[model samples]
Target chain A: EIVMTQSPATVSVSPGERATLSCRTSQSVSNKLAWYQQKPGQAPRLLIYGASTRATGIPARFSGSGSGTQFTLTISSLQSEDFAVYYCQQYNNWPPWTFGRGTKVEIKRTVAAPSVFIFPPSDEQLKSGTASVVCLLNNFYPREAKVQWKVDNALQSGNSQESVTEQDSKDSTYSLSSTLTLSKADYEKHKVYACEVTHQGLSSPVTKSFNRGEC
Target chain B: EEQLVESGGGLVKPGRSLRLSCSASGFTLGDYAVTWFRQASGKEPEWVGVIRTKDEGGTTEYAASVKGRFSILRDDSKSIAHLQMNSLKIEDTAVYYCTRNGLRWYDSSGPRGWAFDIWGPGTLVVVSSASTKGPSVFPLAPSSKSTSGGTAALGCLVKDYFPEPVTVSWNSGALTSGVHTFPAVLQSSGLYSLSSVVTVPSSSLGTQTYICNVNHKPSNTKVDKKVEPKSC
Candidate 1:
């Protein structure tokens, strides 16, 4: 049986703009097909199957139509959450159905959230009454960002920090990393410390909090 | 020869039980088997259970997690199969689907098994009160061995996600070579556990940083863990 393939690689669109994704099969699969939406972190959801019928709860804005070896999935007006990867599966053949590689729907610039990690203090540092903790923030886009440190909800003045930014060639977006250092005295006095990252591409400031080991 | 229509999935409260049905036509359940799959938000689809046709003694196979609390039953006369589970939890909110294996007793494939070609429209079930949380992802440090011309193995472990399915991959500047993803296993509490492994030629393991990326759907989050070679 012939496998299915999706084209355009990536569909770039702004919010409220219409986007169309295409799928083609190696051979005619009739109308026995399905379309699914796979957001960045989620499993793919069925959008349309049998070529034209929308799955339950799928908004009317999303439509599927095609036959033989060609098919298309259309979104009338794109929404923020609609930025995701789309796939087409053909079941018209054997017991082993196959899915196309996937076409990603992205914002024109495609901003992403930062991943924050807090390093725990070592036992030696803890026992010596002096310790250091590092907070690492990664993968935010747009190159411009602000990282703030808070101890017990109060902003902490300058600690030590550094950042390196780079552009992702495949996606045409930027990714960068920032690191924050803290001393043992700060860890001992404050029960919680938070790393807040604000970026123009993000909808809201992303914050990750770390707590000291309990006594 | 007929398509399958899966229905009867909906919201359920914690500790409650629910039943789902897969209705089919244009085909008989006498020789074909019905396979069941479940997918949690932002996760990969997983096998739940399967009910064999009357010709195959109508046997059933359930995932290790589904054996005790879940049951798969079929009515050959009506060309229908049912999935029933008890003590549903919020993590059980997901879509359940069914497909039929078009196998014949006389076929030369000889029970080697094949993929499911005909699938029913999935039924979405939501366990209302449960928190929709993604799993905790842990990317272990890379280890190298001096076998097969020297190779480095990288692994990513994901646990505690509701529903099923998380996409795990290894990247180092570019896609890593020789990646293997294991099946997502179910934990005792009904969440999923998955592990992925990637191997690279020792010679190719330069000073590049290797990354393990985990994409979880329910929470709509993606996390990356990076580790560089110690002495490459």
Candidate 2:
């Protein structure tokens, strides 16, 4: 069994800034080293492996170097998804694979407004006499946000669909989405339905209206 | 939405044997690799074993913690993977997740394999003499849409399970190319939600039945859904 250790424990940087992380193994593992990025609740992603080979779809800004027992993972310019914990693992030893105690990549907190997207009903959906509106929240930090619905400026107790929350590995932020279903009568009425988003960081809730005209 | 389901999660007494299975849908099982992970509360997931096949012959790789007691099997034809552990002990109690390997195109030389991108909802197995529970199976519907340039895209959705982690695969009439299974996303209630997509030529479109299978570990249970064209 081999032991893996990481230094600096944490890296503090701002968006668009550069940061470097180091990993050291107790004994030489040659080029069988791999780097992984893990967010708050999601699974860890393989960043670099085989010493310097980048994993699939990895950006050029992230690079790996060094062989033997010492290795480094360099992030040229930090992105939102890059602000997560990083771990180094060695597969050369086989039996007892080991990973370094993760190094936290802390990005200076900056309030950014969430990007919203709405999916209106398609022709097929309209033909079927059933409709749904999907509101997507992207690139929001703090991970604290809520979505509500309104019909003609009045709050409505609508049926809410399953919502999904995902951590952005690049910028180390968060995004979420929720869906609200509309019945055939509602679709025929063609009344305006608004998706109101509330977040702790923002002073007022953000709202977007959906209707047949928008489609 | 393509997805994977793992059932057969429960509690067992010491010295008993446990078997976990994962069934895949919306993608072919042979094209990608399958791996298993074990995690205790508040701890990072630990890699246990994987079903790897290469030209030189493939075998299962287990972490030292489970080498002698764990065995992994893959039924390519059935799109299912089984992980069995014998001589269970109290320490064997943990949450297990099955994952699919994510491959990257390295270069002209070959393909460079990386991490587990697609994952099943985890199954909680306890090695004690207590009441046990397996994952509850639900209806999975497959849908299709017409993509640009006369390409038809098919999707399968698998949702609702306990302990997390499920394997999903998609199958058609002898068609296996251009299939992709997205990673399972965590729903608001912390349950499993996943989908797989496969695009085929529009000329190949028909009313053929597209099958999606969800396999749950711990309970070793398998559930499947067949979707026809308009029935999607």
Candidate 3:
């Protein structure tokens, strides 16, 4: 099982600027790699396949470069929806088909409604062939809040919570720390998940989202 | 909202078996697929099996880890799926998770790959030992609302103990009236949960203090959780 390492966990890019995401395989796996774009709370849209070939309808501005062990996904002009997480996957006859920790392209400095954030598992675990991500529920509440994790905008794993209570010193408010784990094959597949905290603290169900992690 | 729920949890003993059911909502099971995985303590996650939903049944692929002993099946008529594993070992302690595709793989033709997801809030399983351990007791935040002259309700939650038949009492047995203790429910992690509710005489809550004592024979320990009533 070769590990696919993605660099610069995230990228800070504005619309109309160039954004690049990197993936490095531990060993040469030929052109068995692919790349996809994941908008918040949606399934990953395949853009680059067979290492460099564009999917059926991907735009020219969205391109794949490099081959074998090292690859890069380039977005010539980042669009609003393009400012999402992008990751790479390797699928050859060899098993352990894995994924790259995704690189998030934020709008330089934007924000969330409930400060919800989805974090991919660390580089260490993915190297071991496991993928588990943590969710941070920040900046809300009278200390009255809860969280639920959703994949593909559905209530798949409705709030199976064993939350770690968080009390941020800076904000003087409360939040939560929730986590969910995934498998290597599942991680290689592109699916978006949301970090949602539902409760009296927020009138609406506010969610932060991202797709599969590098693991 | 799209949903995936897994149940069928119990305290599994070594050399027994493990079975889990994942129920889905908001979407048809025939439209997608489901995968089952597990992560033993301190080990990386391993994908055990995958089952593609068909018009009536489905096709399943399994990892070498639990090959002959693992099978994932589904009955979309009930919007539910089932997974069964036989001859569980002591080393089979870990959290189990069910995953699915964020989007349907095919419009109507066939199955395609590439995507991600989680349906479980994963259930934990512990291949338990005969060790002596006491149950952990906790107080559910007591109700802040009390009637003007009706009954007041107090609660205590007990969990994570084994070798059952644990004893539960209130105030050393003096305050036993209106006590309703639920049966010890086995957790997927191999622990036990016992829930108790004590009804107070007066509606004026926050005017009393009572202790819930849980006695576990295996560990020779008693857990006490204080239920402090408060005025709303």
Candidate 4:
């Protein structure tokens, strides 16, 4: 079990510019990272995990891209719906779970078609065994949504994931990822690992999967 | 398969207090906390609170939310878990449930923050039926109308209650006979109005007249209307 830490505790970004917040843990949480949105007295809604998978029915504009101990949450185009407090929760530990204090996202300026860029880890990075996933959202809405990972329809265990979002004038993006541990034999099987993102919007989830065993 | 277990039969007496159990049969209790919830007919369930049995640490911080009458009770000897709320009221009539927190994996590199997702089956409890109450009354418009004779009929009305079904009595002089009491008909708004009318006695014209009232719960109150006997 690792202690999750959110930096700045708060940040400010102009409507058209970019802002980034970091979620770090005391120990290597693997990739059992997840992000949630809570406003005032309302229950939290899941946002991003596994560094990239957007939860079911969530907006395509609101994407996640990041991995490892250092991750980022970004927002591409700032919509009024995007303004809210966000927190990060860790899964790898039993008993003692943790949450980020929260970062408040506010709009600085406005634009017709705002563009937010995420430096999603390249395929070269995943092949290297270390990676990150980044998503971009233009005109964001703060809806109750979440993301997760599944191995062969069964939930994989012992992975650490987290969500990070960037602020500025435009887009919003939140990302998280899992660091899968494989034995020599397990890594050789070439299994299909899928990332399922969930929210209330679309009927089906926005999915992204990987075959690290192929490497 | 996860199941929800209770202590006694689903039926309970009105005044007797009961604490329903919702322990998990298969999963390890140490791995997750037990969350309590309540949902009434056609309504959404509410999160009462989460109880961690292994360390008994999580709840110490759950102030006010569960700090009052409700709490998590575990008998480690029997391996049973349930939520307990004391001094039960009729409003407590609802179903309770427990859920395992769904956790997101952590990133070896960054911060991974996630917790419970799925829930256990619900346990329903029906509090013994008690007294039936009446519709609420917020006096909208209260006024009077003229009947006829050397005498006049003084009425106390609230909104559109024609052939009103309220308990109306003479606050001044007596009526020709007994009072008219009937249930009010419903208007387009789906609200039913009832009226009760009682005539005052002729001899009591100059004396104090009382209009004793009866509502659903029919609180004991009086609506007084002054009636002056016409000049002889």
Highest-scoring model, DockQ: 2
Error of 4 at A9 (Å): 2.0
Docking class of 3: incorrect
Query: In CAPRI terms, where does candidate 2 land?
Result: incorrect
Q: DockQ numbers for every candidate?
A: 0.03, 0.09, 0.03, 0.04
- Comparing 3 with 4 on TM-score, the higher-scoring candidate is 3
Candidate 1, residue A146: the lDDT equals 78
What TM-score does each of the candidates earn?
0.40, 0.47, 0.43, 0.33
Off by over 4 Å in 4: A109-215, B1-70, B73-114, B117-232
Task: Write down the DockQ of candidate 1.
Answer: 0.03
- How far does residue B70 in candidate 2 sit from its true spot (Å)? 3.0
Better of 1 and 4 by DockQ: 4
Per-residue error at B13 for model 4, in Å? 24
Question: What's the C-alpha lDDT at position B149 in model 1?
Answer: 34
Per-residue lDDT tens digits for candidate 2, residues B1-232, read 4467676777578889989998888887666667787767646567788877443255777777788998988888888889998888888788787876554334354433344546676677778654333333322222221233465555444444443446666663354554444445554655554544455555555655667666656446566656444222
